[PDB]
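Objective 1b of the project was to move from sequence-level analysis to a structural picture of ligand recognition. The entry below was assembled by the postdoctoral researcher (A.K.) and checked by the PI before modelling. It contains the amino acid sequence of the target and the SMILES of the bound compound, calcium ion.
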Amino acid sequence: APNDQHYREQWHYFDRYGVKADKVWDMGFTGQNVVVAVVDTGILHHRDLNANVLPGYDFISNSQISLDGDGRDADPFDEGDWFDNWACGGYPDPRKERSDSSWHGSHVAGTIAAVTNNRIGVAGVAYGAKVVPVRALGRSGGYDSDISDGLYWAAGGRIAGIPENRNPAKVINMSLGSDGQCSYNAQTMIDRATRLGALVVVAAGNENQNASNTWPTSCNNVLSVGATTSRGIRASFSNYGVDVDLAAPGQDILSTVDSGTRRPVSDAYSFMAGTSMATPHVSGVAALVISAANSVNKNLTPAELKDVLVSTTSPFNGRLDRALGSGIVDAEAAVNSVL
Ligand SMILES: [Ca+2]
Ligand SMILES: [Ca+2]
Ligand SMILES: [Ca+2]
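Corresponding predicted holo structure:
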């Protein structure tokens, strides 16, 4: 077991309806030599992340989304996607007036590979793995073509006027999405990323609607992730349906953020809910599964990896409100299967 101060609060790693990450660390697999790309709001300079973060890239083209004064650049720092006075919003809706910065991509990155065994803060599912921040979201979200470009690069794809990725990822985490069917361009980048060897792991979404009505779930060649609670049932906001492949803890998830309401001020930790929190659990387990597959000289295709994760899930608590894949992702059964 990890020595980090607040690991006990991370029920989602160890408890009844957790991901049994502890049972894999017991075997010596922590995702060593695995790289996971996080296509999200970018990364904080956080004492509980720094050492597990690789060079990334900022794909945000609009400088009024990026909030760092230019388009695409080599620094994936999360400037903070805060906004005032309906700057992203449907005025006059009071619920759309203002958001503090989410630190979303850092909360996601922490779930995968927070610095673990360094006493401070929290653990990550795959703390021996490293994270490549692919910043594609900022104030208001992000363009789909920035997201698509970002995910292709994340897998080792070359992009015009961007230096080659030295750290191509075996797993690409997309804690994001919106309404509408998968675009041609998105589907194409996903297929190309997959042909490079990457597993694309995506959030089902948070609108209590059929995930098929959204992307990236409606795309081929993704692993779509629903959200469960500490009681092993569907979190009420989680999207659902036949295209949800499996589920993972998506409520009361503790990870790494900043205290700043606008720009980074100091390292913090908070709880979040969302299929966005569930996804990095599956991406971390994916990395665990790969480290174990490496150990017995076994190569796994994205298709093989997705089937290993989908077939080795633990049961839900009851038949569930809605369809939410095969079960809760289960690192113990997944790893045991490949050995
Ligand atoms: Ca920029
Ligand atoms: Ca930047
Ligand atoms: Ca820590």
